[PDB]
Amino acid sequence: DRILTTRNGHTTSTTQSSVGVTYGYATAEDFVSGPNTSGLETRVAQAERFFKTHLFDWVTSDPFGRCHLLELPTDHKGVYGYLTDSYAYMRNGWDVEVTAVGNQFNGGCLLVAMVPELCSIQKRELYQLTLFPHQFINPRTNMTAHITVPFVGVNRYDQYKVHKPWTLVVMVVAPLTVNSEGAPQIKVYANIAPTNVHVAGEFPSKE
Amino acid sequence: SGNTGSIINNYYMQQYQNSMDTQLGDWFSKLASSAFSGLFGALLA
Amino acid sequence: TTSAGESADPVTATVENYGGETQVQRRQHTDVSFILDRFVKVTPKDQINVLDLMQTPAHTLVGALLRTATYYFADLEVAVKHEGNLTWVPNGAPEAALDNTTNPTAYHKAPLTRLALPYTAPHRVLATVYNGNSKYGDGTVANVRGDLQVLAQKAARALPTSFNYGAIKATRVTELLYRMKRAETYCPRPLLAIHPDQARHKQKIVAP
Amino acid sequence: GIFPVACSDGYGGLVTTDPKTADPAYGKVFNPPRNMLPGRFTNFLDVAEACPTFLRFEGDVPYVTTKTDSDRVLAQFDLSLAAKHMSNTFLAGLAQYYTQYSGTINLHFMFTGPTDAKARYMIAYAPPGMEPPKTPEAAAHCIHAEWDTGLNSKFTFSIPYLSAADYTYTASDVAETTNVQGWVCLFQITHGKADGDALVVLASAGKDFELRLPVDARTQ
Amino acid sequence: FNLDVDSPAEYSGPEGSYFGFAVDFFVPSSRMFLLVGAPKANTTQPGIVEGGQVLKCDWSSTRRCQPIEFDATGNRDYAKDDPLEFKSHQWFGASVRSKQDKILACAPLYHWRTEMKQEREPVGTCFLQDGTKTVEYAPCRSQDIDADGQGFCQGGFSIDFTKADRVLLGGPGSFYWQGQLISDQVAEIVSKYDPNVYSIKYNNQLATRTAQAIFDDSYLGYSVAVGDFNGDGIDDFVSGVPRAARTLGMVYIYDGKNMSSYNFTGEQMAAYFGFSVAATDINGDDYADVFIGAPLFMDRGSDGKLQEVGQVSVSLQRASGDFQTTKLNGFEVFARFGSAIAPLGDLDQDGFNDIAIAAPYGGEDKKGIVYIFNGRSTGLNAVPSQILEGQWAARSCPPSFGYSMKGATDIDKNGYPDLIVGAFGVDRAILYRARPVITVNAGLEVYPSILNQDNKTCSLPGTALKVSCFNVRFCLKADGKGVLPRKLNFQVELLLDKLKGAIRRALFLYSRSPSHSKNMTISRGGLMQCEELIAYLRDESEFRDKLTPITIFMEYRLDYRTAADTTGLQPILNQFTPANISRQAHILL
Ligand SMILES: *[C@@H]1O[C@H](CO)[C@@H](O[C@@H]2O[C@H](CO)[C@@H](O[C@H]3O[C@H](CO)[C@@H](O)[C@H](O[C@@H]4O[C@H](CO)[C@@H](O)[C@H](O)[C@@H]4O)[C@@H]3O)[C@H](O)[C@H]2NC(C)=O)[C@H](O)[C@H]1NC(C)=O
Ligand SMILES: [Ca+2]
Ligand SMILES: [Ca+2]
Ligand SMILES: [Ca+2]
Ligand SMILES: [Ca+2]
């Protein structure tokens, strides 16, 4: 009764322990045809695929609130990051997918959250990270969390060299409790993908 | 409508009072109304 | 209600699950357009005051409740007690245009002069804390402590100097008050109440 | 002649919350379009009802640890929105700017133990009037509920709103130190090999939770 | 009291080089030397003005002070046209500590460019030399950096060796001046050395970690001392934290095995409690006693006026774990008594260790004073048995005689430990030698002591009349430890009726005189020498005074000139030992 294998473009991602995809803040995209671009935008369909990245190593000595904040977009050394140095104005959503593979005998949990415009946080502020598009990961139930968000922003197209709208945040809510039969150290990976990018305005070539 | 309490019409029209909004061509009320309730298994009385 | 504990879809185990019933609930006092359009005091400078809404304090009601939103749209009307003549200037004009009287001055009428300003920003929606390229941030590194620390706090301040409703300039403003109407908010942020050191934060409530 | 009026006395002062709108000064402004922009909320309770936020326990942590001894009280906190345990919750964030409320408060209980550790718990509501119960035998006579840890690992228990008056104060009294609105107690009844394992708790606004009469907390 | 002041060894250096800012002894394996720190001395290092150097001063024969090359190089580069370090004015030699073949010197104001951005942070550095070996030791020069890290650590501001050959290093600037104690074994300092690695990790390193922000600006590691305090043999870490507890000053003691936390605290604001610390067993109970200095302490006099005199807190270590703290105040106002505290070992070889405390800005013309305090059973004798005076005038910076000093080293093999005093303000360093202590068992017997005026036993040659006589008898016996002559000639003086312009009622028989001297020559450790003679009473009708007791006085003086040895180090007689004794005799009626 379960369709649990996502794909974006020509790359797939099958997980067998998906509790469900959480659509944050919208189920559909905004009007991409703005009046601040005079109709000179175009969709690049070849930017929609996953790209893997490493986040941290959740070990047993990590207390509450060992958070990790990577700003999206990060250094993409493929097709998507070519558009950052070749087009000035661009917009996109994201559909992140973090993996924390241990086994079903570890304990603890780590919250995953896509949060816009995130800087200067407190550890007393971490209590209310649930407000954002979030999805828990505990090894007793699942291994992945699959969050999808649209383009938010102050204005319709963005300059990603001077601005980073989203921030993938993973923090640890309960510490990793290994047992006699669990896994000692788990490593948190993530494959991130854009959704329906739209560039506008060609830079001159660097030559 | 806000924190207005007047039944009379405004004196200044609509565009010397506010800034007019422009269409081009909500969420958490739909999110809080799709909340699951009841139980998960076969209940008794 | 037993649920799927990690899917993060909303679940509301109501009070009917162990007998009983729910009552009709009214939520007018928690509406976002009702709770934000009342006057709040900010501290003024002597003459020139940019009409940014993020200079409202963080302890007051609609300053700590405006920072609940990431993105906000609201028309501002101010109420300022001054002496002299107070010229409002729209968004992005040169600050030498505060002296000119063709800009919408209000002559001194005792005691104070309230006037309704439009949303003059170029952006579709303003924002509470824009972070183009100021914060990383997943764990800022130890940099400045001791004396230098006080100035180091303004390192992370907001940059879209286009996040303002304009500026007002008088001879000496004494107390200028903000309120924001037709307020639309987007993308909520965490809201914090102060930390009790006792079993419960007991303060002296009003009593005859 | 002209239309005679009487400039009435006592009226017309500046009130900070009045429904009088100020006279415009600069018209003909057309905003940039904002329609169907993502993530809009209308009332602050819908954020508080659709998004649960953690609690606070001893050690600045949201989780409560299972207890391998004869004492079976996991947590026992008084029921107010100015409590110590409820302090970091978003629900008590906006209830710091009001005076009185009514309605249910959902508590969400997620168990984060391994697949071989099993336990069962109970949560009871002790209404005010005598001392709160210290054993799960004594707390069986409250409006309680039990659940055990299995496949679905989350439990949501809606705190009933029992009161004499129709609305109860969200600010616990400064001098009066008995907390005569109520206690809520959660225990463990047993656990199988669940030592050192956690139970992260959350709180949300209920289905019929509504606040009333806004004031200014002013970081107090 | 036994220190030589007549002709002490003087050593000098370049003017302005601060010759004497730090001093120590160097005893390798069989010549003896002196180490003087000159942190402002110019070097031949390429393009480095006032790099500072440490000088090995030959005590044997001439007074030559040959500099020691720990580092002859200039500023290494991080990249092309990008200096890695700044050895200019690095104050190398500001702290010098030696143990057998190992000499450790440091540069507290050595600055270092980060391996990232181009900064100039005073992490401080040190150079450890083991005979032919010479490595660099910069524990604060790490990946942890500026202000909140170890960037402003100034590692090497104070240093000390333990008995298990482990280095103790202090840096008052770590973690926003919280300060840091760093301890490494001398094995790994050289074994893990790498000329191409600027931040060396040591596997067995003990260190104080960073603490809460309220501990900032406390200056831990300002001064250091070593001694055992938990009774496990391993030297523990004593350090002054002079700005801790809102400028009240504290002193921390950590375990020398795992850096586990006693804690001392001051009584007065801004008295600089912890400016100097010292650990030595002062009461012979083999329990290391803590000495803490607070040069800025103000005391009240009989006029009830505050006066800055300085204070040292003597904390005796009891087996109970507690301390028996005694406070010792300064003597001159604004002299900053307690700036330097130096264990001397058993200076007089009496059975208890001794200690020296200095008031560098005291004495006439701000020359400087060093006070010598002797230890005993009850603790430290609060009265100084000797007062060492500076002999040099000021130029710009005051002579600072006593600002740094080192003792507890028998450098001349006389059986008695010596003392170095550094006066950097005049670029001088002074070695005081300890003179051999001679204990002397003097004796005096008068028999009979009850004189019968009508006895008339002893006849008197020249007259048919006989006189009432009696016997006087004096004895000498002396012995001493260390190196000293086996023959000892003394000058004994005897006076009859010492109490008396007045008439003396008794005189010696074979001289007819109340005064008699005897050149006596006894042997060290040898038997007691004893010469006796006959004294007689005057005739009854020669004086009326018959009630006043006739006091017999014996006094002796040692020939110091002939007791001198090789260099001319003349022995001295023990303190608290009467140089003269007196017995009396009565007449009846
Ligand atoms: C009168 O005058 C004569 C001459 O001056 C006195 O002669 C003295 O007699 C002393 C007692 O005999 C004598 O003492 C020393 O010699 C003793 C043996 O003759 C000997 O026994 C003593 O040892 C002991 O003596 C000490 C003395 O302090 C006592 O304390 C002990 O208890 C022991 O008895 C002495 O070695 C002394 O040498 C001698 N002196 C002279 C100059 O002849 C005589 O005592 C006088 N008598 C009166 C009237 O007082
Ligand atoms: Ca020890
Ligand atoms: Ca002792
Ligand atoms: Ca001694
Ligand atoms: Ca000697």
UniProtKB/TrEMBL annotation, chain A:
Compartment annotation: Host cytoplasmic vesicle membrane; Host endoplasmic reticulum membrane; Host nucleus; Virion
Function noted in UniProt: Mediates self-processing of the polyprotein by a translational effect termed 'ribosome skipping'. Mechanistically, 2A-mediated cleavage occurs between the C-terminal glycine and the proline of the downstream protein 2B. In the case of foot-and-mouth disease virus, the 2A oligopeptide is post-translationally 'trimmed' from the C-terminus of the upstream protein 1D by 3C proteinase.
Spell out the family assignment given in the record's similarity comment.
Belongs to the picornaviruses polyprotein family.
Q: How does it assemble?
A: Interacts with RNA-dependent RNA polymerase; this interaction allows 3B-1 to binds 2 polymerases and act as a primer. It also allows the recruitment of the RNA-dependent RNA polymerase to host membranes.
Name-wise, this protein is Genome polyprotein
Q: Can you name the source organism?
A: Foot-and-mouth disease virus serotype O
The lineage, from the top, is: Viruses, Riboviria, Orthornavirae, Pisuviricota, Pisoniviricetes
TrEMBL record, chain B:
TM region positions? none
| Location(s), subcellular | Host cytoplasmic vesicle membrane; Host endoplasmic reticulum membrane; Host nucleus; Virion
Q: Which ranges form a coiled coil? A: none
Q: Quaternary arrangement and interactors, per the entry?
A: Interacts with host DCTN3.
What is the annotated role of this protein in its UniProt record?
A: Lies on the inner surface of the capsid shell. After binding to the host receptor, the capsid undergoes conformational changes. Capsid protein VP4 is released, capsid protein VP1 N-terminus is externalized, and together, they shape a pore in the host membrane through which the viral genome is translocated into the host cell cytoplasm. After genome has been released, the channel shrinks.
Homology family:
Belongs to the picornaviruses polyprotein family.
What name does the UniProt record give this protein? Genome polyprotein
Q: Which organism is it from?
A: Foot-and-mouth disease virus serotype O (FMDV)
Give the fragment's position in the full-length protein.
Answer: 216 to 286 of 2242
TrEMBL record, chain D:
Function summary: Autocatalytically cleaves itself from the polyprotein at the L/VP0 junction. Also cleaves the host translation initiation factors EIF4G1 and EIF4G3, in order to shut off the capped cellular mRNA transcription. Plays a role in counteracting host innate antiviral response using diverse mechanisms. Possesses a deubiquitinase activity acting on both 'Lys-48' and 'Lys-63'-linked polyubiquitin chains. In turn, inhibits the ubiquitination and subsequent activation of key signaling molecules of type I IFN response such as host RIGI, TBK1, TRAF3 and TRAF6. Forms an icosahedral capsid of pseudo T=3 symmetry with capsid proteins VP1 and VP3. The capsid is composed of 60 copies of each capsid protein organized in the form of twelve pentamers and encloses the viral positive strand RNA genome. Upon acidifcation in the endosome, dissociates into pentamers.
Location in or out of the cell: Host cytoplasmic vesicle membrane; Host endoplasmic reticulum membrane; Host nucleus; Virion
Specify first residue, last residue and whole-protein length for the fragment.
505 to 724 of 2332
Q: Which family does it belong to?
A: Belongs to the picornaviruses polyprotein family.
On the tree of life, the source organism's domain of life is Viruses
Record note on quaternary structure: Interacts with RNA-dependent RNA polymerase; this interaction allows 3B-3 to act as a primer.
Could you tell me what this protein is called? Genome polyprotein
